[PDB]
């Protein structure tokens, strides 16, 4: 289905601390008020969704059913790929070739170790009576791989009306060609969401502690364009100038007068007799 | 040496000084870089090749060399950009009855390519009759055994060789040198370098709340104001050592 991502998907673009200032960054973000793909689970769904640029994965999960993610473009041992899982109190991010099955499950069934190339171990990313929100921004840039995270309580299904930044949980410089991702979980009433990040220019309001407290998009609506032009949140009454209305070209034209001279190649190639 | 092992090394800082601080590694022939210089240098991947040879065949582990080891067992390319480490080990690698756990390829139809490994034991058909897998006239087993003995000659005494190759090619560096954290001088004006962040000014003690993942601190005009101490997760303000316009 479709839902509304009102104001969600704001991650710290830089490890640079600030205070009480506003910083008009311009990076790959998830635009405000976007129709995001909604799923939920006898009935289920598990396609192979394309990892176009960046996915604001959200999971209003009652009790930690989602079990990792799988990324890549082929996922059949032909191309180097990766697997991220969430063990009871640990996680593993490996980079191997893999061969999967239609219904891998536990009480798994796939080639976990094949032509491997990278491994990772850490604490359980999915910490743990509320359907705790588990936002994760998955993105790759310049041959690096970035993830973000957040863990907030949820009372009782649609995204809340609130703003929460996302710390950079873990970085990992893998740098492989990726196109399509697939989520992983186990059933034996949980929703997983997939947005799509797009190049965009944002305003962010760092608080007195370097923590983000509010954000404004430049390209959303005229008033937001003013806000992003004055570099301020409140806008005093007036008439401001923000940008330049410009029309774009439509098609392509090439011109040249009628051509009359053709090189006499036939007389050489189709000659009746060649010289010695 | 014919079945040389290769240990790929990554996700780690290599203290080269440790092995450089050991006389037994007498033979430390490197080519293309300086050991001391690379201890502040970084690479994407490192490969550690180890094998055992005789006393005098250490020269064969070198670019542009020839011989049984160089042509059939372990060939280095002409454009070698790494180090060679070799030492004598008569105690462990040798035995009183002679060691039979060692083999060197003696016959092969064609010289190896650089860093090629060959573990196939197929009779070297030197003549024109097929061998069918049994040794005989013009049919030789590819490998033979070194008779390492305690009383053997130095040129025949055992020798362990470790070859390090460095390839930082289009890959996020995973191996750098452990440049020791140098001293920190506070309240006296200095020139500083903090994890690739190298300005000039006086270091001081800070009190500004810093989020743990945050590293730097920028003021209005993107000036590096606060810097996380790399070892201890504390914060050092950088306000230029006290100054104020001089008028006479």
């Amino acid at each position, epitope marked *: 289905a479709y839902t509304n991502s009102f104001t969600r998907g704001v991650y710290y673009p830089d490890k640079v601390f600030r205070s009480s200032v506003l910083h008009s960054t311009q990076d790959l973000f998830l635009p405000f008020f976007s129709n995001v793909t909604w799923f939920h689970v006898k009935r289920f769904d598990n396609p192979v969704l394309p990892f176009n640029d960046g996915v604001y994965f959200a999971s209003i999960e009652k009790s930690n059913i989602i079990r990792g993610w799988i990324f890549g473009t082929t996922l059949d041992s032909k191309t180097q790929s990766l697997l991220i899982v969430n063990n009871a109190t640990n996680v593993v991010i490996k980079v191997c070739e893999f061969q999967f099955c239609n219904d891998p499950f536990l009480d798994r069934v796939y*080639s976990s170790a094949n032509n491997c190339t990278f491994e990772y171990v850490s604490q359980p990313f999915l910490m743990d009576n509320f359907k705790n929100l588990r936002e994760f921004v998955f993105k790759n840039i310049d041959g690096y791989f970035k993830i973000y995270s957040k863990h907030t309580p949820i009372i009782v299904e649609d995204l809340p009306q609130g703003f929460s930044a996302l710390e950079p949980l873990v970085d990992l410089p893998i740098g492989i060609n990726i196109t399509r991702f697939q989520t992983l979980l186990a059933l034996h009433a949980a929703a997983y969401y997939v947005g799509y990040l797009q190049p965009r220019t944002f305003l962010l309001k760092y608080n007195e502690n370097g923590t983000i407290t509010d954000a404004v998009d430049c390209a959303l609506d005229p008033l937001s364009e003013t806000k992003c032009t004055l570099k301020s949140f409140t806008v005093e009454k007036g008439i401001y100038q923000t940008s330049n209305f410009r029309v774009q070209p439509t098609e392509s034209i090439v011109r040249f007068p009628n051509i009359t001279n053709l090189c006499p190649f036939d007389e050489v190639f189709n000659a009746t007799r060649f010289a010695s | 040496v014919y*079945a040389w092992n290769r240990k790929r090394i990554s996700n780690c800082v290599a203290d080269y000084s440790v092995l450089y601080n050991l006389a037994p590694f007498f033979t430390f022939k490197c080519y293309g870089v300086s050991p001391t210089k690379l201890n502040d240098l970084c690479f994407t991947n490192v490969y550690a090749d*180890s094998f055992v040879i005789r006393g005098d065949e250490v020269r064969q582990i070198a670019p542009g060399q020839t011989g049984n080891i160089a042509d059939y067992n372990y060939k280095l390319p002409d454009d070698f950009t790494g180090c060679v480490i070799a030492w004598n080990s008569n105690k462990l690698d040798s035995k009183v009855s002679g060691n*039979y756990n060692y083999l060197y390829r003696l016959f092969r139809k064609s010289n190896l390519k650089p860093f090629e490994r060959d*573990i196939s034991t197929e009779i070297y058909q030197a003549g024109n009759k097929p061998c069918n897998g*049994v040794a005989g006239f013009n049919c030789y087993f590819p490998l033979r055994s070194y008779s390492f003995r305690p009383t053997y000659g130095v040129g025949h005494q055992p020798y362990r060789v470790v070859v390090l190759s460095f390839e930082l090619l289009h890959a996020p560096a995973t191996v750098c040198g452990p440049k020791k954290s140098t001293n920190l001088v506070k309240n006296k004006c200095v020139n500083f370098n903090f994890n690739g962040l190298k300005g000039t000014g006086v270091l001081t003690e800070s009190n500004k709340k810093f989020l743990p993942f945050q590293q730097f601190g920028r003021d209005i005009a993107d000036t590096t104001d606060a810097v996380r101490d790399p070892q201890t997760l504390e914060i050092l303000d950088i306000t230029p050592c006290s100054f104020g316009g001089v008028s006479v």
Partner: antibody
Amino acid sequence: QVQLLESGGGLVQPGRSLRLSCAASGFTFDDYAMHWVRQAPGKGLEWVSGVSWNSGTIGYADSVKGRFTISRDNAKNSLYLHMRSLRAEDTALYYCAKAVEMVRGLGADPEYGMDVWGQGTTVTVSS
Amino acid sequence: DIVMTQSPLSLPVTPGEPASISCRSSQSLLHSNGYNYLDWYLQKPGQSPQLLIYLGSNRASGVPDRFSGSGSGTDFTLKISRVEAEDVGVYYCMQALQTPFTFGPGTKVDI
């Protein structure tokens, strides 16, 4: 699950060669010392050969020394056992076993603890 | 080049009682670390053998706590605190100090 598959059995005349192959799947190949152990028909076990984590062999049986040749390949997770000078007294099963202690996990490096065993082949010799 | 022996050669055990088997060597297996390198293995008839005890007395993983290993120097003992109907087969002791390794002749336990 950890898997040890061996192949290479078959009737061969005396005075020939063979090459058994053992394939490992389900663990990091370079942190376990592999072993080759025979099993004669209706008799006890008998150690044959072994290999450390760094592809360094650790000697062969006293009565077989001179013909057998072991080799390792961590890239393909493949262990091989070239066999020479085949005689009628070499007919037996052959398991490839694995060590238990991972290297550098605690004095010296471990070589004991043959815990996991694949189903051996049925190499035989006769004329 | 070390030769080991076991005793008794073959002993009948009945389910519900302890049993004791001794493995003896020629050279003491005490290493510089002080650890014994003898290991106990059970090769059930018709099935691939299994590990029972490694490093002298350190219990192997996944086996019940009904087995006990003791001894040092040149004499080691394996005691099954309680025997049942699934404790029949052949037992061996294998050295792990001086290469090449060896396996004892074997004790045959039955009902």
